[PDB]
Symmetry: D2
Subunit: 257 residues, 4 copies
């Protein structure tokens, strides 16, 4: 089977992607923080229910060395490495005038620097194994339009968008492709947090902010990991071999770029 690593695969969009890629015939390397291993258990169970090989790989994407060994371990255990999905990331909700250098340093490390490290490690591995790989990064609608109150987060996603473009161009001659998926409003822990932090600011009751930000989706429904998985499935398959440097929206109809 082909091998793909999904960072942040312990839960949310990461888990959904892992389950889907497994159904597509990929053996999966579920990479996420070491403390998230128990949480990853379910993700692992889903991969194995799809009749594929799964292994958890402890990783803090903010650390290059850890990312390099994380990918070596994954390739070793699964006997290959063909796709890297840089899904791991965090969100920050805070008025622009309140953002601190501390906030910035932290979110750029987890959301941007990590992608540089994952791209570099994926590249080394691909070449080492003598194969053409696929790198898939998690952008967002916030990478296409900056969102108020989520300025720090938005800027890191824009950075990911720009990185996807530059990296795809530098790795293209080697035959590797780099694309990104941009989901809309996905009811995961990230939004329970966003909605919770928004509530503390505007006073709207819990869950209410989620509904308002969701009221604009053309298809009239908030998203679930499966929706995002569908696009990532394409980005990992052979059908996307001629697509590179793009950031594709899977937002049910929110932005049209």
């Amino acid at each position: 089977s082909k091998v793909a690593m999904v960072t942040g695969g312990a839960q949310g969009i990461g888990r959904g992607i892992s389950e889907k890629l497994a159904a597509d015939g990929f053996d999966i390397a579920v990479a996420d923080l070491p403390q998230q291993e128990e949480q990853a258990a379910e993700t692992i169970k889903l991969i194995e229910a799809a009749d594929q090989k799964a292994v958890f790989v402890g990783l803090d994407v903010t650390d290059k060395a850890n990312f390099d060994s994380a990918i070596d371990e994954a390739a070793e255990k699964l006997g290959g490495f063909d796709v890297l999905v840089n899904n791991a990331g965090i969100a920050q909700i805070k008025p622009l005038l309140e953002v601190t250098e501390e906030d910035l340093k932290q979110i750029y490390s987890v959301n941007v620097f990590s992608v540089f490290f994952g791209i570099q490690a994926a590249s080394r591995k691909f070449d080492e194994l003598g194969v053409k790989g696929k790198i898939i990064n998690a952008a967002s609608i916030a990478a296409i339009q900056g969102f108020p109150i989520l300025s720090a987060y938005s800027t890191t996603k824009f950075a990911v968008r720009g990185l996807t473009q530059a990296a795809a161009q530098e790795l293209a001659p080697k035959g590797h492709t780099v694309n990104a998926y941009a989901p809309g409003i996905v009811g995961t822990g990230m939004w329970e947090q966003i909605d919770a932090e928004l509530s503390k600011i505007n006073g709207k009751p819990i869950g209410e902010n989620f509904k308002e930000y969701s009221s604009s989706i053309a298809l009239g429904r908030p998203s679930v990991p499966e929706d995002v998985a569908g696009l990532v499935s394409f980005l990992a398959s052979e059908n996307s071999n001629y697509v590179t440097g793009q950031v594709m929206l899977v937002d049910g109809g929110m932005l049209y770029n």
Copy 2:
């Protein structure tokens, strides 16, 4: 089963899309100009070889009435109608200052008005059958960045881009999605034509223009109908359900949007 109509399916990108969707398990209605029914023989041959039902449908996409009946016929012959691919289209190569009103009327009818007609007929057929359909339009890199000497063509593709966004939002409540594919340099009959005409204009030898316009492709190789077929496969599949109003580039890396 699932039924899809591919206009301009008698050759080039249209044929490849028909063959791809056939492999995906779609019964195909190859819609093209009556004059191309013979040229379309091979296409129907490629479809039946993938063990799917294929029927030719005489259609001049510029004629609304013909498009309405064309879809009625396809839905009656194949027993259903789930996907429409507005692929039929033409190219014009001419310096801006030389473009005539007749050039404009001609190209806008085939490249733009036709997509409106197709979108309307498809939407009505989806509703009659009680199906949530997928409409896929043929955009192009020229729909993202206007190209000199191909201004008329570029403008129609930009129109398709805008139409794709507008139609997606308008048809979302019925559950229908509208997306587009934007290929780069695809070595089909259309580019033989483009290279030939550009040759007469700038004087460069035959084939040289084709190479010239291809020297920017990150992946380092021009495109074939198969490359585009890959994206359309995703757009016609269930994996793209939460994607709408988007114009996705399959250009090997030329524009990044």
Copy 3:
């Protein structure tokens, strides 16, 4: 004195642009439909009040020959021709499924073919006069994001967007630049018509659709011609000499591209 022709200058944005460019030192050729001369009386008044020459020129931008004669007349009566603002245009409001071929031919003629003709005529005159000119087209937020119910209109603006790009690249070697302005919701006769047609569709009282569509403008206020004139002033000035092929948003904060 520097000379600028403003098509559709009898009222709305065209009138605002005329008055502004006059204030900037331009003599203005107010080009509009013959029956609009009386209406243009105010535009001309506003222009002459800035110690500048103003002349009404009968022009139906949908006719190539008339555009040529109009620019010739403007150049001869004002003694030069430095800037052409392709502002004339119309709006159509109608569900996508109701859009007829007649509607399409009409709106594309007025909003798109007209711009080709305008660009061609302006380019000729510039060269004839041995000067480098500025062509400024009227785009719209609808050229950046298609709007439902105004699908035909949106597609024409996207076409204008593409035309601006293609033309800028094609005319650059001659030193001419082609840019466009993209206003948001401006209270003119065009929005009176849009609001009125929307009202017929959703039953909202007159003025409410305008208010609703304007409720999300970041700067918290609908637009007036003067706002747009601000950008066009830049685009007609020496300050924009190194800007070309761009579609610039002056929408108070609606779309960000």
Copy 4:
């Protein structure tokens, strides 16, 4: 007289902007590294030659505390504060696979974090003075399309693009606007550096990389500070009052977005 602070105004585009704004009627605060004071003496001369007041303010934009005191000092010395131009920035030239965390921390601090700091300090001063202000950020064509070998730098500019959008929406209620200028290839000390570094990488002789990258400019020639100052002049004037959250390209025709 109105007051504007131009960071990195000791030379290059910053100097060009300071001179232009001075010419438009603004008193200028030239903010740059203390070591650049002597260098800035040239900028100060160009400003005073316009019969406008000028002062140098020692500022390392990466230091938030320093940025707050610099704006205080600026507003106090010039008796006002209406415009802030976040122009200070650096470039890095290095293959993606070689980018280090040290490079990233470095370039993001100077190119992105500083902008957050400037916006915050500007906003606070604007409100303190009870005025509506304009914030203008230095983006780049690299903020619109990521460039190979300039990945780190590109990603920072994309972040600035996102920041400009998010800040615009967040500060709009107060009446402040935030926009950005995106220069193309400007022959300043920065490109001297980029060319020199590119030279060591691809072996091309000195100066050839500058020409190579410039070859594609529609208007046929590289840019000078004044080309950029033209757009900034618009961005600092009342003509841009209804424009916000935009990143406008002044690249002579390289990217069209």
